Design a protein around this nucleic acid. Sequence first.
DNA 1: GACCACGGCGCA
DNA 2: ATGCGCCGTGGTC
Length: 534
Amino acid sequence: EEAPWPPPEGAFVGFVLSRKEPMWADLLALAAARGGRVHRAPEPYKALRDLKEARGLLAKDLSVLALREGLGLPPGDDPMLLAYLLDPSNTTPEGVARRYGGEWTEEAGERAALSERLFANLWGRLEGEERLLWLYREVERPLSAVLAHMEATGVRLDVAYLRALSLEVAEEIARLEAEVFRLAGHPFNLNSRDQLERVLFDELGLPAIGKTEKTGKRSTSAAVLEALREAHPIVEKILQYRELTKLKSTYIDPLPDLIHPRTGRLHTRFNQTATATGRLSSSDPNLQNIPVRTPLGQRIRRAFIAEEGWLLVALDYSQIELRVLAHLSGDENLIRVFQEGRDIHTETASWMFGVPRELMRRAAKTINFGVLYGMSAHRLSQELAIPYEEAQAFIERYFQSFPKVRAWIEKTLEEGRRRGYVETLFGRRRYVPDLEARVKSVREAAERMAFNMPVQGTAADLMKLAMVKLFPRLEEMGARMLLQVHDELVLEAPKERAEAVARLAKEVMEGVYPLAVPLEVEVGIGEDWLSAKE
DNA sequence: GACCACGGCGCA
DNA sequence: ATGCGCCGTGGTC
Ligand SMILES: Nc1ncnc2c1ncn2[C@H]1CC[C@@H](COP(=O)(O)OP(=O)(O)OP(=O)(O)O)O1
Ligand SMILES: [Mg+2]
Ligand code: NA
Ligand code: NA
Ligand code: NA
Ligand code: NA
């Protein structure tokens, strides 16, 4: 079925890259398949100009590359998106191909023919599934195009700043290390958890708290060291060393080396079919886990800056998962809190009775989260420095204040056992087979994954939809969408329009989809990521 | 050179 | 006793 290039319109494209990252890859081959007929392009780059849309497996990748080359080529249909909506465990072409009667190879033609077959088989599986079809048409397909532009745009990084920070951090690392060696009486590789384990529990007299999952080594995790804070002066220094070496090795050092030559900016990949809940993920580099919670983290956030003459706009959905929970469960007390414009964490702790709003909120905050994950009392203790007794109680009072949440959890599990899957507000599905496992530990783990999904997944849907609606508006205002961090959006705007952009973006996000409770958005504007988050 | 399992930890 | 992706160590091929 070999015909000369070019191919008819609407043909499924197949491409081969020298590496997985579209912004860094050489385009090795380009082929298209239509009516079982395969066309292979003599010169991939030149041939790119003939396409008016990228339709096929991993379409966003080819689109990102086209944008890199100055071509306005939009991603279209992608069988990966259909498969992922059918079952979120469909995360790769290799896995998908197998499951649905194909073979993911390394040739552009075969890949183009794989795309065709796969789209047929998957689309047919989606007839009658009108809610998934809605997700595909109204969210995932348009979203892929938005993500393609975010990836091609990238974000500006202050390299000189990071270079200087690295040298300072290094100095502090050496001092902590030297001190650790002093307390240990001898040098050793502090980055080796095995060597550290012997030092702490064999050479020093320190008690071993917990063991590691796979190999049963005496754990040296932060949880363990924290609980060992005042059993010996050395552990305190090890925690500081760990924080500093984590951020230096993971962010401070690698990021400056990843700046693209043409753009002078940092380009991440927004993976659209990689999670079980419907969230995006970010990789190569991951810009969804840039530090922020510690002073040194905040200093790292400062490295992310606006282009000169522009500003960063950062928008954050307040407590979106709790709000989704209020809607899903219908809990009146919970809904009331939000509709009255109250702050749940300050309200939730108010039910340490006798205080409308005086007491630490980070406890009520720790609790609310613990509810989302199925956290047990024993965990609240370590995560609150509170005796096991006062933890188990804190949890019971919660389900008294918010009864319908428990009812919703129970109902979600029961339905999940029935149908074999649970679903988001919009109908996104996750299959959770182990709900009927006969080992309690396995069964209950499955239950936590099961009831968390509708909460995490609805919040993901709301944000995705918000991005879809917001993107066209930004273009008209001459603004850029840069990053998404699950419940946050980071935009780039010309200094003069930043304020106007902030108003608009905020409103679009808050109105994305009216629920039983309002969606509130914190918005900030600044020269860098740190100052943009108020 | 590439890849692996593990423990560990950054963010939502 | 939620969801990700990346790091160094210790290791194979
Ligand atoms: N330590 C932690 N453990 C688990 N999940 C966490 C977490 N920190 C954040 N998350 C996830 C779970 C939900 C989300 C919470 O985001 P915020 O941290 O900003 O807390 P918010 O609800 O906004 O309270 P406010 O900011 O008003 O004090 O991030
Ligand atoms: Mg917040
Ligand atoms: Na499955
Ligand atoms: Na990509
Ligand atoms: Na997955
Ligand atoms: Na990688």
